[PDB]
Amino acid sequence: DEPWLKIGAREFRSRILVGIEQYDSVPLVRDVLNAAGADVFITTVDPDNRRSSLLLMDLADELPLDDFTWIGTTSFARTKESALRSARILRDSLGIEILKLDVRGDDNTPDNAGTVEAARELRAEGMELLPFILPDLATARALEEAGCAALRVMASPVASGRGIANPAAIRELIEQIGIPVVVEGGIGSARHVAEAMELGASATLVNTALVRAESPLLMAAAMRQAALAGLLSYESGPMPEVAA
Amino acid sequence: DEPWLKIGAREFRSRILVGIEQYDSVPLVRDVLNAAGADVFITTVDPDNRRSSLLLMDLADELPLDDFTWIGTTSFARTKESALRSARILRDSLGIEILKLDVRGDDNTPDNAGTVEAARELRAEGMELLPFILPDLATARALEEAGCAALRVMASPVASGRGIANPAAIRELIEQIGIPVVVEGGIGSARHVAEAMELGASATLVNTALVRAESPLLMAAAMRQAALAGLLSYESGPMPEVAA
Amino acid sequence: AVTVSIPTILRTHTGGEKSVEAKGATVLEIIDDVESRHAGIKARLVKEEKLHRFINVYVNDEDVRFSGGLEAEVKDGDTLTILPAVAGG
Amino acid sequence: AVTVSIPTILRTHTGGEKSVEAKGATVLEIIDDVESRHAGIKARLVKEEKLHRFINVYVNDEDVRFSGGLEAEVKDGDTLTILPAVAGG
């Protein structure tokens, strides 16, 4: 395999990213990241106490955190102002250079306009961004032009397990966007990963799917394999479907 | 991995089966079967000259045919009577004990009733059968009770690339049937394999998808990986989709 | 005469004709008689004085292996079909 | 007094209360004063006479690292927030 993204010295090789804010067991996190083949570790702060996600203190003891690229996220924030604040706390406190940028309201859905506003601000101070958006061509071009390193694009609602709601729109967007696109949101199983990759996705971000599989570890292993199968399939130029 | 089917001394390990009647290049067949990880070699006769599929003479020279389980097929036949005749020619001429039983009319679609009639006849002389059917519970029970070793069930029309047209019906059938179920027909890409396995399929049979991918070899490799990813996903107990 | 059906894949050797005429009493005479017109075909049908393991020959729809192989009887007016083992789908 | 905000994950040590009262002039005095009531918490906050690298402390929303660390000034009526680095989604 080859890296699908490079930001400075940091290489992203694993085609599955794994969000970890829902686990309450440090050994399980260690084991899921292992099974998924993850090389990205996702870190944040929770000013409003929305969850009780594990302390880096407790994770650092039991995981080889130096083997991962560290990225920040602002996904607990519920205002644009609060996301920017969290992004700048992650910079100052941990030296985070790479941010998984999330601006959602109380509906747990990316706010495209507000996200673009936050990206202009953070790019202006040299932060490297992976912003989350709904699949809007205009929005995706603005962020590309602002120098975002990759886009995250919503397949379906968070924790819905519905897979990819509007695949054609995601295909159309990936075709027009030069930078890598990560599909994320609502991914329920390995078949959804392979579907994401056959639309041209560079990678996939899963979260709830691993937390809520009967066997998190096996699903992690399955999605790792689905990502590579998905990629190969895409590159092989699959047959066009013969419809009406 | 473990075998997903055993007929006498013959073990089926590969979760992708590969039909080979459309290739006109012996090296390519050798290479596709390799890429797909196939362990089953599919053989027939063409009384009516429907195609110009490769001679076993020419294949035997360039492939290690002894490393494969040999099964017969009656898929060129267009009547029930002609299928039975071809099945009995394959027995007498090559000692084929295991038959991929196909009774279709001129619409290239399995004829459930006619297939059940042909299975009763062939089981009565000790032939081991993998019959192809549309997903009908009654039909699937009759063949199971007649001692068929596995069922092949149609996802979508042949060469359509449409994937799985009625997944719930295929799920429902696999739940009720004890013997292994192979999904087959209309499989267009690796994501369709993984979908098939997440419905509970033991294996998948692909044909047109490899013949018509820009890169047959890469698609073969992708489906091999999709089958294993698909299986793991299934076993991990994926999250139920949250719908309306 | 004996009308002999060629399968598509071997019609290369018979100048692309799906049928040929011939004369002979055994299967092997009918082969030799066709070779004389259409060189190369016999090589595809027999190997070491025996029918190729991956070739089947019928006389009016009866498999010749149950009836003499190369030495099976051919009357005048009989149809002789060549049916090779092939890659299946 | 100085009202101190505890994050959910550490409320184990403060008998499950999301806030405590305290007295002190530096950050470190405010910590020691809370330890005296609620043993165990200080261990989570400091390591080798320094704030844990994975812990952040704010005085009325100002990060204390830019202002003295443990030695940063605390007036009476100030709010002191503890904000640990956590696993993100």
Side-chain angles (χ1 to χ4, degrees), chain A, chain B, chain C residues 1-48 50-89, chain D residues 1-48 50-89:
Chain A
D1 217 9
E2 294 204 334
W4 58 270
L5 174 57
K6 285 156 134 70
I7 300 162
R10 305 309 315 188
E11 284 175 7
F12 297 66
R13 272 166 181 286
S14 170
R15 300 269 189 174
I16 294 288
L17 289 105
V18 180
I20 52 168
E21 96 286 4
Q22 308 190 42
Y23 303 104
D24 54 30
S25 164
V26 173
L28 183 53
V29 171
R30 174 243 289 143
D31 291 328
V32 169
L33 291 172
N34 216 69
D39 57 36
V40 172
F41 180 62
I42 302 175
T43 195
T44 190
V45 293
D46 203 346
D48 318 312
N49 304 276
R50 305 207 95 79
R51 277 221 176 80
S52 314
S53 80
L54 295 161
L55 295 153
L56 263 61
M57 284 191 286
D58 303 324
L59 290 157
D61 291 338
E62 297 230 74
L63 283 69
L65 298 190
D66 276 291
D67 296 355
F68 299 91
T69 293
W70 288 36
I71 72 179
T73 184
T74 66
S75 58
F76 292 141
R78 300 294 136 181
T79 59
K80 188 233 286 174
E81 289 84 358
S82 184
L84 291 175
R85 180 156 203 270
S86 277
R88 295 173 171 129
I89 286 167
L90 293 163
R91 178 198 56 201
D92 296 340
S93 64
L94 305 179
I96 291 291
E97 299 192 20
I98 302 164
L99 189 80
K100 174 182 171 301
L101 170 70
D102 285 279
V103 180
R104 339 177 159 172
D106 297 314
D107 51 26
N108 216 23
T109 305
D111 174 1
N112 273 11
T115 295
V116 171
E117 290 157 7
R120 298 232 164 81
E121 299 299 329
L122 294 174
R123 291 302 298 147
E125 53 179 317
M127 285 227 69
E128 294 278 350
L129 305 176
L130 297 82
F132 199 21
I133 59 169
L134 305 164
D136 179 67
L137 255 172
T139 302
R141 278 171 186 145
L143 297 162
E144 188 172 36
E145 274 160 33
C148 291
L151 311 179
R152 292 147 53 217
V153 312
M154 195 172 221
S156 66
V158 171
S160 70
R162 307 210 277 99
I164 314 191
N166 298 122
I170 293 188
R171 196 190 318 276
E172 183 185 14
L173 184 153
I174 284 155
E175 287 166 332
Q176 293 292 304
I177 295 305
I179 60 171
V181 172
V182 179
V183 167
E184 162 173 355
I187 300 280
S189 74
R191 93 172 169 287
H192 294 154
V193 171
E195 189 183 2
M197 299 307 271
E198 290 187 11
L199 304 169
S202 299
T204 302
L205 197 150
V206 311
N207 197 326
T208 298
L210 307 183
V211 181
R212 292 190 151 263
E214 298 189 3
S215 175
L217 282 147
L218 289 175
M219 181 61 80
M223 307 203 112
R224 173 177 212 175
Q225 283 169 48
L228 298 174
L231 183 63
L232 265 156
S233 186
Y234 181 76
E235 287 178 337
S236 76
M239 66 183 294
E241 178 189 10
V242 177
Chain B
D1 217 9
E2 294 204 334
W4 58 270
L5 174 57
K6 285 156 134 70
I7 300 162
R10 305 309 315 188
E11 284 175 7
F12 297 66
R13 272 166 181 286
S14 170
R15 300 269 189 174
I16 294 288
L17 289 105
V18 180
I20 52 168
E21 96 286 4
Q22 308 190 42
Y23 303 104
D24 54 30
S25 164
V26 173
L28 183 53
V29 171
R30 174 243 289 143
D31 291 328
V32 169
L33 291 172
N34 216 69
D39 57 36
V40 172
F41 180 62
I42 302 175
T43 195
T44 190
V45 293
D46 203 346
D48 318 312
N49 304 276
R50 305 207 95 79
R51 277 221 176 80
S52 314
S53 80
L54 295 161
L55 295 153
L56 263 61
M57 284 191 286
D58 303 324
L59 290 157
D61 291 338
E62 297 230 74
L63 283 69
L65 298 190
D66 276 291
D67 296 355
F68 299 91
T69 293
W70 288 36
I71 72 179
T73 184
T74 66
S75 58
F76 292 141
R78 300 294 136 181
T79 59
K80 188 233 286 174
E81 289 84 358
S82 184
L84 291 175
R85 180 156 203 270
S86 277
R88 295 173 171 129
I89 286 167
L90 293 163
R91 178 198 56 201
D92 296 340
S93 64
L94 305 179
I96 291 291
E97 299 192 20
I98 302 164
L99 189 80
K100 174 182 171 301
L101 170 70
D102 285 279
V103 180
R104 339 177 159 172
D106 297 314
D107 51 26
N108 216 23
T109 305
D111 174 1
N112 273 11
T115 295
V116 171
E117 290 157 7
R120 298 232 164 81
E121 299 299 329
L122 294 174
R123 291 302 298 147
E125 53 179 317
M127 285 227 69
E128 294 278 350
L129 305 176
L130 297 82
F132 199 21
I133 59 169
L134 305 164
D136 179 67
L137 255 172
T139 302
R141 278 171 186 145
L143 297 162
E144 188 172 36
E145 274 160 33
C148 291
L151 311 179
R152 292 147 53 217
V153 312
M154 195 172 221
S156 66
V158 171
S160 70
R162 307 210 277 99
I164 314 191
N166 298 122
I170 293 188
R171 196 190 318 276
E172 183 185 14
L173 184 153
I174 284 155
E175 287 166 332
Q176 293 292 304
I177 295 305
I179 60 171
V181 172
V182 179
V183 167
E184 162 173 355
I187 300 280
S189 74
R191 93 172 169 287
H192 294 154
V193 171
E195 189 183 2
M197 299 307 271
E198 290 187 11
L199 304 169
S202 299
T204 302
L205 197 150
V206 311
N207 197 326
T208 298
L210 307 183
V211 181
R212 292 190 151 263
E214 298 189 3
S215 175
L217 282 147
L218 289 175
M219 181 61 80
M223 307 203 112
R224 173 177 212 175
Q225 283 169 48
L228 298 174
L231 183 63
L232 265 156
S233 186
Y234 181 76
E235 287 178 337
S236 76
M239 66 183 294
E241 178 189 10
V242 177
Chain C
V2 196
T3 178
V4 175
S5 296
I6 320 303
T8 305
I9 323 92
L10 296 166
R11 301 182 191 168
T12 325
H13 306 81
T14 66
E17 285 303 281
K18 76 177 202 278
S19 159
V20 306
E21 292 296 87
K23 289 169 192 303
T26 61
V27 165
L28 174 55
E29 288 185 331
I30 297 285
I31 284 170
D32 287 340
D33 189 55
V34 160
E35 178 74 318
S36 70
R37 306 211 218 179
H38 303 287
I41 195 165
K42 196 252 186 67
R44 309 249 66 184
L45 304 177
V46 345
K47 193 194 202 197
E48 281 131 50
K50 301 140 58 182
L51 279 175
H52 204 308
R53 64 174 310 193
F54 295 140
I55 288 290
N56 312 291
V57 174
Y58 301 84
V59 173
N60 312 308
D61 287 345
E62 282 185 47
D63 184 339
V64 298
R65 278 193 229 83
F66 299 122
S67 168
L70 297 162
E71 307 306 327
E73 292 177 41
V74 188
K75 292 178 170 187
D76 187 84
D78 281 347
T79 299
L80 191 136
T81 314
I82 309 181
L83 190 73
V86 301
Chain D
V2 196
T3 178
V4 175
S5 296
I6 320 303
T8 305
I9 323 92
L10 296 166
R11 301 182 191 168
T12 325
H13 306 81
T14 66
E17 285 303 281
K18 76 177 202 278
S19 159
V20 306
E21 292 296 87
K23 289 169 192 303
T26 61
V27 165
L28 174 55
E29 288 185 331
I30 297 285
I31 284 170
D32 287 340
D33 189 55
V34 160
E35 178 74 318
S36 70
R37 306 211 218 179
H38 303 287
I41 195 165
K42 196 252 186 67
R44 309 249 66 184
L45 304 177
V46 345
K47 193 194 202 197
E48 281 131 50
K50 301 140 58 182
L51 279 175
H52 204 308
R53 64 174 310 193
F54 295 140
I55 288 290
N56 312 291
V57 174
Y58 301 84
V59 173
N60 312 308
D61 287 345
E62 282 185 47
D63 184 339
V64 298
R65 278 193 229 83
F66 299 122
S67 168
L70 297 162
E71 307 306 327
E73 292 177 41
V74 188
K75 292 178 170 187
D76 187 84
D78 281 347
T79 299
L80 191 136
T81 314
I82 309 181
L83 190 73
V86 301

